[PDB]
């Protein structure tokens, strides 16, 4: 027995998942393509119409599921959609997807690109969560991607103000970011306490270490994303510019570009004053003492100067000190972080004053 509602045809035995409203997703086919067949009830026929329309407008993005067709019979409405590997919940909870060798930062960059696309088309998802974010089937080059599907919300992932602006999605994304990164934790705790904690603004990002550079940069972003004030949350395009998505090569380039921007620059100047403020503690009182034994033999403003000079004169430097420092650029920048885990976070926050400048266009959003 196999249901055929032309051009759609699904096998009733093959079930991919279930929906909270009674909807059931089957493994089926459309125009000789392997698709996912979403079966919806008559109570949700109205919902289905606006869902497939929003998709008609946005499915061209590679991070928004591809929508194929909708066929209606006397009993149900069927949505032929792109076939995927798992949900982001199934990916994070079951670490047998570990062997897929996917990068969490790449999945979150992919999720935020899809979100940015919806927001650019003047679409607010309103229900972003790991169940709704999908893992694609490996393409011909074996690459897997994160995609957005299923468009008032679902408990624990709803912005406090929602109890219909784009910033509601940034809140939800902020929780998804921590969920992926921590590997299953949520800023507002366990599943059943989340919405009460959101209303109360009671959050914890304690999986993120305060003296670990990767955890520091992730926290700078996530805290602004899950902000109780919507107006304080960055746009999707601002999130995509954050150092959380930068490569080790890019991070080092920023440290060079900022040290190039200072000198000549007077201390009373509006740029040098904002950079020096509160670090001190960023440099760990004295940066000369915490450095490795051979480098010390060879102010943030002068620490950045040291890093720029040793980078520039790297191949005309002794083999003993380039051994403890390099190889450049990856291992060289990883030397200084987490030697100073607040170095990049502080410099990025401080150098915001130059966002508009052409040299700082790949680092900020205007
Ligand atoms: Na797509």
Numbering used by the authors: 562 to 712, 732 to 743, 751 to 885, 896 to 963
What does the original paper state about this entry?
IRE1 resides in the ER membrane. It has an N-terminal stress sensing domain in the ER lumen and a cytoplasmic kinase/ribonuclease domain which are connected by a single-pass transmembrane helix. The lumenal domains dimerise in response to ER stress bringing the cytoplasmic domains together. IRE1 then undergoes autophosphorylation, generating a specific endoribonuclease activity that hydrolyses 2 stem-loops in the pre-mRNA for a bZIP transcription factor.
Purified, dephosphorylated hIRE1 crystallized in the absence of nucleotide and diffraction data were collected to 2.6 Å. Our crystal structure shows apo-hIRE1 is a symmetrical dimer in a back-to-back conformation similar to the structure of phosphorylated yIRE1, and distinct from the face-to-face dimer previously observed in ADP-bound hIRE. While the unphosphorylated activation loop is not observed in our structure, the kinase active site has features associated with a functional kinase: the conserved Lys-Glu salt bridge between Lys599 in β3 and Glu612 in αC is formed; the side chains of Tyr628, Leu616, Phe712 and His686 form a continuous hydrophobic R-spine, although the side chain of Phe712 is mis-aligned; and the gatekeeper Ile642 packs against the αC-helix. However, in the apo-hIRE1 structure there is a large void between the RNase domains and only 227 Å2 is buried. However, in the apo-IRE1 structure there is a rotation of approximately 13° between protomers pivoting about a fulcrum at the interface in the N-lobe. The rotation keeps the N-lobes in close contact but leads to a ~ 10 Å displacement of residues within the RNase domain core. The contacts between monomers at the apo-hIRE1 dimer interface are symmetrical and mainly within the N-lobe. An extensive network of salt bridges and hydrogen bonds is formed between an acidic region at the C-terminal end of αC and β4 on one protomer and a basic protrusion formed by the β(−1)-β0 and β2-β3 loops on the opposing monomer. The activation loop is well defined from 711-726 and 732 onwards in the ligand-bound structure, whereas residues 713-731 are unresolved in the apo structure. The twist in apo-hIRE1 disengages the RNase domains, which might reflect lower RNase activity.
